[PDB]
Nucleic acid binder design. Structure first.
Ligand SMILES: Nc1ncnc2c1ncn2[C@@H]1O[C@H](COP(=O)(O)OP(=O)(O)O)[C@@H](O)[C@H]1O
Ligand SMILES: Nc1ncnc2c1ncn2[C@@H]1O[C@H](COP(=O)(O)OP(=O)(O)O)[C@@H](O)[C@H]1O
Ligand SMILES: [Mg+2]
Ligand SMILES: [Mg+2]
Ligand SMILES: [Zn+2]
Ligand SMILES: [Zn+2]
Lengths: 647, 641
RNA sequence: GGACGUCAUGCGCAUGACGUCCCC
RNA sequence: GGGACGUCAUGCGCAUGACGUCCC
């Protein structure tokens, strides 16, 4: 039984009458339900005018396909039309061109559609309604914009195109600081979705107000005026290393500019055969990491970060199943250095009084807010993955949290480009569905929790010194819309984060005023501006179309002669491997492939057709041409390509 | 008779007792008078302890040497000590090492002292008090910081140094947006001047308040909702050119990103022998210039900017004693077709910019409050100063109500507008205090340092820079019933940029209040750390600093080899081949014979008429091609003629 | 005329963190 | 495991304009 609330109608009306539009409805309003109502209405009128009704709903996240089916599309359309959900995760034995022709309502991740459009074929004439979910991403080189680039390309050259629905809560300002540049970004994503209007709940605003409960805002600041024993004890150690190698920073200890400098320094050193310098630079990064860990997490984690790093070196340096020797002077210096000051750090880390202030501010904000209701739920937005896994263990090892009600769990990302190891797509469901059950009470999450996914309503949402953009700001507030909701920001004065959130509050307020002006804009003006942005949106692709249209291997640490370019061959289209048979002797094995001479990590052992072969990563070698030298980050940056192992 | 007011004392006290400090006193308080009182007090105590008293007062501007002498230092110290003023403008036949030894009070531009320190020699032991004027410049690779880098270098290695006075009004925040990074910048320039404290008028704040009259603030915004006929008529013309060459922008018309794009495009085109493209890109810049001129100045100036540009091409293309390409004849005709329309449209006063009517309105009311009022208009570009002058001239109602105006621009030779002489700036500024000139239309030049008369109105005409210059500009208006106005348009972003500076200024006062309240063990340890890394910042620059054919950019002809070019003096590069006489033409200026592109200018050197060549106008071809901006960017150096 | 520095604005590139999608 | 995209922070470079200095 497919109703709409009065505000939902007001926003939908022009889409029901065929106009391409963007829809701005807050989190908890039910923007997807408006999509459903529009697909049906659109499709019914094509039946009743004896015509084609094919509707494709694009998303940016695999769980949103199956979530949009179960909870919105199937219940209201499966029994009248042919509905399907697609993704890369889907195991179908049917090509996408077929799925177009066999189905009426196609929900899928936008890249599935773009993959087909790349190239019997698929094209945008085949659909009559394209609904883009979270359309603020229709921007730059995003998939959504590449789709729309084609649509717009056809429009201008035509002198039979589908209808386009944009779905979002807040379109954004695109990092701008001026009300002029707010307009310009709004108009730009209006222009990318060829919208005849951006659409907001004006006439039924009072009704919307009651549906979504706006939370109570706080900014709990931490003036770090405590003594910082752990900091001081580390900066000592770092200065002892900086003298040893004679590499002096232009930057504060425990900060980004230091981290950038010390990484540039490790590279340069490695390129110039200066082991002593790079090894110290490598170690100096880990110490710098431990400082900023001490700023945010508990200091036992900072300690552990170092302890584990020096534990790893014991395995890689100590031999097993005769040499000049792996253990260098520089290595033995740094190892001893840490082993000397270790006990001090450990016994200092277990003093709870010198743990970070932010943690006591977090503790305080939790304890009061988890004692207002008998069944409360909440989220902590930490910045790094490690800080999620740590704050979990912080809550575990702390009986007062558990006693008052808090049973917590971390919720991180999926990627394989982090030093912390991810969660599976499936493992995220396991938590999030436990969260709505009440099994898990408190999500400690990275950005992952901010957009899209259906997470239970929250009584508290804590941004633990995390600020990103205006969009994510307002998304995070949307996650807390239960009774007596609270949106807290727990930063320190030294961060700059209180002032960055305050700029986002200014930006958000610009965004509402840029929407109010593009709406009030006379149509001759609006038309002429949108056409101009679209004309230059196509030219932005032409400049990238010119951009895109454009030896020996040595151990970074000890500079040994190991491999030629001819010795390396690709497996599949990614795993590069060596084929020489002297090569057996020049590496060692641990639990992982390390240099025999120096114990530097080279890669890992794999199996391929019952053969134990060595994988080599480009991280860990200096490439020598002929003379110029280089460290490349990923294999694709090299100039010559290697042949496949087996032809 | 050398007094101090009660606030001036409070601020000076620790300097009188020998402590290195920075002094923060508003514009109109008399910070220089505190320098005078400190030099005398310092020098008197060295006489009376039978010892060396040598004091060097560094400045950043040549007029401030002669101004500090006349109006502060000589009247109170010439009759008791040996006072002198130095600069690069000074015509002395005496080396600086001598001037050190012969004089007690040495006022000079800081580079004079650094030149000597570079290298009987000069060094910082020779002075006992160094007073740095406008010490907020003691930053980065500024001269003031290179001086202090040496001072700090000696300090750390010593295990007999002078006292150091920092003079400023507002030290700044250094572009920061966080109260954490405000502290960090304050501490950094505290650390560069080795100050024991930043010093502000707290105990006698009420008295200071009365001395300096704080102006009434306004932000007169212009919602440009008018029709813009001139704009539309130009964008038409630019689209006609963009189709012709097939170079399409990724940017708005009449803006910076367009200007950057269209300059990158002219270069690329010139490197790749694509005359058609570059010539259009060159012309497209001039059209883009005329749009942003239309945004700020009157539109007759935008028209004139184009007319004069196409007039120049008539001289360079028409022969005397084929040059005209298809692309050239296309663009020329194109302008000649749409010309009369632009001219007759430009003389319609109703379609001139709104900001000008907002300016007009803000002037007319504020120049009718007092019978003798004075004021300043801070425009952005030099052209917009010279234009707003002519705007006020050609407008009898300004003159009738009292306004007699004049422009006040810069000195440099790196602008498309031609400068004022050091002397010409005095001629205006001293006329301004006389009442001969009523209204200065100035670039940034008027904001810092120079003694300009007090103002009833100061207008920032869509100009915003940093917090420092903001507060400096407010300082220029401290007469009775003073007003500080900002006249920007909603499309600028400038109202919001000034609002960030207002936030930044407020951070600055709070960062000062915290470094002052900071316990000394903490303050010491932070200053020593910034100084330690300030020296390392020089070491990273000390590694940075320690690191073929010539073809006409337009027509790509073979003109000169590297061997054909020889330097005159250490700057004017010139060709010596004698086929070379034929390949250029002469106008009123050296142009290509084939295409009429400007190559340089004719000079005389030992009675020889020789051709100067600028690197702007040639594609350098190795064996790769390149356009270099200035000769020093090339890899091989040429011998002297 | 040359060199150097500072400020504002805009553009581009790099590093790190976070997230996503597609493919094997 | 590879490729692409986006977001945040930081750093670097180039362009335009304005200003200053020093040496010619
Ligand atoms: N017209 C309606 N009548 C009744 N319930 C509705 C209606 N629209 C939406 N809902 C309910 O609200 C839910 C939408 O919540 P949510 O997904 O948070 O909104 P959004 O799509 O804005 O994020 C639906 O799943 C449904 O349970
Ligand atoms: N203690 C004082 N007694 C008398 N006049 C003073 C005193 N201090 C300053 N002045 C006057 O103030 C003028 C200097 O002010 P100004 O240069 O505008 O301030 P600043 O040095 O802050 O730029 C001098 O010309 C002088 O006549
Ligand atoms: Mg929903
Ligand atoms: Mg003064
Ligand atoms: Zn090795
Ligand atoms: Zn030529």
């Amino acid at each position: 039984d497919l109703t709409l609330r009065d505000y939902q109608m007001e926003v939908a009306k022009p889409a029901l009458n065929g106009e391409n539009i963007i829809i701005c409805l807050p989190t908890g309003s039910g923007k997807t339900r408006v999509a459903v109502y529009i697909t049906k209405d659109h499709l019914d009128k094509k039946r009743k005018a004896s015509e084609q009704g094919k509707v494709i709903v694009l998303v940016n996240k695999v769980p949103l396909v199956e979530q949009h089916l179960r909870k919105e599309f199937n219940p209201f359309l499966k029994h009248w039309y042919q509905v399907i959900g697609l993704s890369g995760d889907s195991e179908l034995k049917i090509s996408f061109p077929e799925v177009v022709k066999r189905y009426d309502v196609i929900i899928c991740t936008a890249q599935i559609l773009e993959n087909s459009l790349l190239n019997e074929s698929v094209r945008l004439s085949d659909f009559s309604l394209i609904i883009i979910d979270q359309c603020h991403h229709t921007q730059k080189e995003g998939v959504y914009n590449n789709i729309m680039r084609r649509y717009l390309k056809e429009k201008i050259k035509n002198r039979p195109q589908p209808q386009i629905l944009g779905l979002t809560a807040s379109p954004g300002v695109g990092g701008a600081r001026s009300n002029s540049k707010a307009e310009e970004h709004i108009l730009k994503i209006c222009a990318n979705l060829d919208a005849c209007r951006i659409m907001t709940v004006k006439e039924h605003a009072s009704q919307l107000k009651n549906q979504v409960k706006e939370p109570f805002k706080k900014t709990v600041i931490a003036d770090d005026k405590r003594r910082d024993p752990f900091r001081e004890r580390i900066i000592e150690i770092m200065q002892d290393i900086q003298k040893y190698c004679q590499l002096y920073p232009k930057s504060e200890f425990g900060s980004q500019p230091y981290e950038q400098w010390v990484i540039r320094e490790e590279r340069r050193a490695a390129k110039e055969e200066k082991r002593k310098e790079r090894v110290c630079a490598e170690h100096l990064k880990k110490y710098n990491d431990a400082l900023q860990i001490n700023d945010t997490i508990r200091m036992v984690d900072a300690y552990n970060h170092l302890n584990n790093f020096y534990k790893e070196l014991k395995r890689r340096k100590t031999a097993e199943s005769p040499l000049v020797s792996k253990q260098d002077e520089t290595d033995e210096f740094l190892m001893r250095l840490f082993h000397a000051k270790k006990k001090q750090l450990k016994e200092l880390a277990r003093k709870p009084e010198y743990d970070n202030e932010k943690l006591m501010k977090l503790r305080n904000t939790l304890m009061e807010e988890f004692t207002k209701t008998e069944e409360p739920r909440g989220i902590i937005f930490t910045k790094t993955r490690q800080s999620a896994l740590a704050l979990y263990h912080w809550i575990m090892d702390n009986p007062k949290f558990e006693e008052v009600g808090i049973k917590a769990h971390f919720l991180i990302g999926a990627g394989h480009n982090s030093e912390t190891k991810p969660m599976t797509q499936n493992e995220q469901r396991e938590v999030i569905d436990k969260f709505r059950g009440g099994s898990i009470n408190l999500l400690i999450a990275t950005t992952v929790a901010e957009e899209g996914l259906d997470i239970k309503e929250c009584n508290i949402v804590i941004r633990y010194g995390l600020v990103t953009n205006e969009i994510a700001m307002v998304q995070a507030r949307g996650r807390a819309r239960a009774d007596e909701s609270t949106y807290a920001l727990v930063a320190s004065s030294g961060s700059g984060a209180v002032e960055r959130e305050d700029v986002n509050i200014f930006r958000e307020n610009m965004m509402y005023k840029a929407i109010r002006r593009v709406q009030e804009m006379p149509p001759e003006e609006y038309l002429n501006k949108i056409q101009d942005f679209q004309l230059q949106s196509i030219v932005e692709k032409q400049m990238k179309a010119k951009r895109d249209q454009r030896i020996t291997f040595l151990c970074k640490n000890c500079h040994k002669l190991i491999c030629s370019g001819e010795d390396i061959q690709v497996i599949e289209n990614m795993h590069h491997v060596s084929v020489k048979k002297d090569f057996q002797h020049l590496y060692h094995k641990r639990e992982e492939i390390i240099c025999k001479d120096c114990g530097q990590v080279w890669g890992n052992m794999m199996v391929y057709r019952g053969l134990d072969l060595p994988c080599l990563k480009i991280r860990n070698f200096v490439v020598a041409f002929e003379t110029t030298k280089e460290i490349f980050k990923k294999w694709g940056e090299l100039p010559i390509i290697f042949p496949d192992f087996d032809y």
